[PDB]
Amino acid sequence: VLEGAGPGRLHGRLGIKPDGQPGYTRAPSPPTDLSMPQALARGGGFNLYLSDHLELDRTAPDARHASCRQLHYDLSTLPKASVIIVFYNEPFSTLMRSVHSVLNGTPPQILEELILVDDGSTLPYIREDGNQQLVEYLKLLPAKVRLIRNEVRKGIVGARMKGIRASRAPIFAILDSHIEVSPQWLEPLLLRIKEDSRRVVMPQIDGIDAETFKHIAGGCKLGFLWKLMEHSYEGHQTARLPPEERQPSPTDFQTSPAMAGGLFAANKAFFFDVGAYDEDFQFWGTENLELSFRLWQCGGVLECAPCSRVYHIFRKGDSITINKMRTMLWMDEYADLAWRVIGKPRVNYRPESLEKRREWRKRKGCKSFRWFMENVFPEGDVVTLDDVPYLGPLRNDKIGMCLDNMGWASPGHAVGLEYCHGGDTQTFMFFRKVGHVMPVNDDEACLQPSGRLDWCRGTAQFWWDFTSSGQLMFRETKQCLSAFGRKLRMVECDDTDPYQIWSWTAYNPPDTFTFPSV
Ligand SMILES: [Mn+2]
Ligand SMILES: [Mn+2]
Ligand SMILES: [Mn+2]
Segment Disordered: which positions (predicted)? Predict the structure, then answer.
């Protein structure tokens, strides 16, 4: 703690020079004649004119529910933590305001260090061979602020791993490079991990508008879509939770099948013991789901802490497919579904190093993905593959044509009727738990009686029954879909009408999933 430590400046007055002036020249108010789209382009998604005009010691509103402030933490018994902030070409104002925010709002007793990881930035203000603005300014901050560099941009996993391997505290908390904290953001995480070292605890994320920089209030539980990305519990999925967990208290810690932002705190030893990150994940993407799956299956738990809140400025290669293939290692027989949803790709997912993580999985004794679905994410639409009874073409023999979803990538999300070619654009799947008829390449798109695709919702407005006669019956209206006239229209159900009889391939996937060759 430097000179001037008090409430709102727990590490002292930051960024002040020997003569007493701040070490950072704040910009004047943004021009009155400033076009936002250009300003956002110049700022890489941020309003830099405004950010550069705001103070690094910026007050933020307490986003915590009032009840969170009725809690006490004994800082002498909590374990120290190491805050890690990775950044690639983060502008000075947002990076240092993130640092100031943490230092000002984190007691020195529980903050071992603050590690800034430069993941190969190229801006002149950061470079080793640049103008030295950043390094010079760090000299005006507590010595517990460190800077470490990657000479080449590694990506999410590589840069975080370097920061984690460099942290000395028993707990590390990973943040973003464009954040502001609510008060007492860290104390909840430390207390929860001290009581059980196997818990990875995520703060809840509020928002900072990228144009106005207004502070905005942010759920908790996250599922995943078969496109292999996290997705919040929809209304119909929280309705499947036990009644005690549907509407949880704001102070309650709540479990989550999946992580999103990448902001979390963990016991360093347990993190490495449970696999850390798969350091073959390239650039960015999906490392949060592989972590979430592996964590739960190998003895960990993932929790969200609503009394721990961080503001996040939301913005306005061939590695992405690889990252998904490697994540499918942890999905056992369900990878067949995931693999078909992302287009049956055949990439070089680096099989040699993935065998090693498979051998690691057994040696550790991790549980199965079926166990994960039945015990961690039983509210999902697909808990067993038996929940997807049809996958293939929806074909009307009478006219000799198939349902064509190629238009889901067109403004008019109209489903069509075309000669069958067997490609993915003519392949549909059925989720029986919700009656959804979707194309295999998007489980967020659902067939409507309008003959159009729209965003799936777990309601009666998307429920279809596939009858034993072959009819697609919209349950709400009890009408059936007909291909009469090469047009999609709803009609009275009548199993003698061949224009409303469809064939749909049953989905009987193998007991285990074999990876495609390279
Ligand atoms: Mn971010
Ligand atoms: Mn949704
Ligand atoms: Mn549409």
Answer: 10-32
